[PDB]
Amino acid sequence: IVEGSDAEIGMSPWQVMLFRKSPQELLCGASLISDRWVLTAAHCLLYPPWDKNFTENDLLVRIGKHSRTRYERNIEKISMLEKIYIHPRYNWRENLDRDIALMKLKKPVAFSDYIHPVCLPDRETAASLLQAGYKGRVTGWGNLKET
């Protein structure tokens, strides 16, 4: 995030970190939508131009996090992936159309002050709120600057 600020504690309890196991590094952000399901961008998992094609075993999801690099004992929960599902019509070739993927977790994650799912919109919420000038909030541990 560029020109953002530090999150408050528990400000984004659905935020999930996608974490590469071997070379340990941040891969991408993601979101918690129930005790077993995590939503992300398809291109985080499958993007041939960048030689990305992760399998379940290549990664972990880390939930309840605040610190980027620190292991947050008693706060964050680290979960393993059962199954990755990429939209079958995800367009990695042209424009990233339908850039969406779901990840099922092996065990359910326990909710806490720091871990809690976000709602998905219904037609009416989407119709009312997705209007020019209306503001949303983006969160992540990505770069603070382009270079």
Binding site: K21, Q24, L26, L60, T69, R70, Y71, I78, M80
Partner: peptide, 10 residues
Amino acid sequence: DFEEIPGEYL
């Protein structure tokens, strides 16, 4: 520059 995670999560 990540702190090591427990091995139980592999």
